[PDB]
Design a protein around this nucleic acid. Structure first.
Lengths: 57, 57
DNA sequence: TTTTGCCATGTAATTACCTAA
DNA sequence: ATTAGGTAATTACATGGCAAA
């Protein structure tokens, strides 16, 4: 498998972004893409996965 | 998956099951497929659809 | 000390089912 | 029928620190 590695500066805006808003919109899902230069699908699962550990944690 | 059509022999067995419980279970999806000769995934979607309809009331 | 030799974690990805159009 | 994005459960794997000769 190709396990993506996140940049210390990506994990940051993601996190910052989850705080303010834990549910991604398409617009928002899009913009993040541009900016972080990540694909709308990984930002997708990230948020899913965040919410997940928060629940189990 | 090709649009299909249920026999009345099947359609009425689906409706009798959907009467006992609206949620299918894996083993039971199985059981009905070998029974009614349908394809699991067809059974699965009938149910979804039915639930969604019944809801509307 | 050092070097080797394992594990246990965290997490990213993935699956199977959900309601709703 | 299909489709997207949600939850819950996983599985794969890249890692750090620990144990021991």
């Amino acid at each position: 498998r190709p396990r993506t590695a996140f940049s210390s500066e990506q994990l940051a805006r993601l996190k910052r972004e989850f705080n303010e808003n834990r549910y991604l919109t398409e617009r928002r899902r899009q913009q993040l893409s541009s900016e972080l230069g990540l694909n709308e699908a990984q930002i997708k699962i990230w948020f899913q996965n965040k919410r997940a550990k928060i629940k189990k944690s």
